[PDB]
Design a protein around this ligand. Sequence first.
Ligand SMILES: Nc1nc2c(ncn2[C@@H]2O[C@H](COP(=O)(O)OP(=O)(O)NP(=O)(O)O)[C@@H](O)[C@H]2O)c(=O)[nH]1
Ligand SMILES: [Mg+2]
Length: 167
Amino acid sequence: GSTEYKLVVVGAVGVGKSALTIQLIQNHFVDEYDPTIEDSYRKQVVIDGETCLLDILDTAGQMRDQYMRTGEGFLCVFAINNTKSFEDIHHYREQIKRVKDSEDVPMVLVGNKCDLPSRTVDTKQAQDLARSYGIPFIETSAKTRQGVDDAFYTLVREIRKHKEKMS
Ligand SMILES: Nc1nc2c(ncn2[C@@H]2O[C@H](COP(=O)(O)OP(=O)(O)NP(=O)(O)O)[C@@H](O)[C@H]2O)c(=O)[nH]1
Ligand SMILES: [Mg+2]
């Protein structure tokens, strides 16, 4: 078996967690909203010449300790027209560090819905927060597929760097 990576997608209700994950796995988008309880998915990919098995947990917007314990890296999603969702990232991250007992947990900040018109969260404020945390920031649109593969592949790169360092 090729290296397995356990990725967990977290963020507020309605930000696009499910829409990003379904683009990655099935290559389509839907407008209809079906709220998530707890979903999981598996996908084989090649990243930087290496075959990876991605094991993805797609979490509910509104159980937390257990997924924080199992995940190796976290996709922290907000929507660019949802100020509260952006503010919520601080609270997710604190809960993660506390569960892992560690200042260093692989994470990627994702600002989704970049296809929409009136953004209430600006790029600079998100870039600033990612610089503070020492993690990457990626803008995405699950509607168009812009950035989707980059978001997940970057998270795997962050997990690889963390194993190297911990060694
Ligand atoms: N314009 C646009 N709409 C999107 C985008 N991503 C998701 N949406 C829309 O936003 C709504 C919520 O998407 P969804 O994937 O269900 O969000 P979620 O974060 O999984 N919700 P939950 O926490 O309840 O499981 C749907 O109407 C969906 O089509 C996007 O990038 N752009
Ligand atoms: Mg969902």
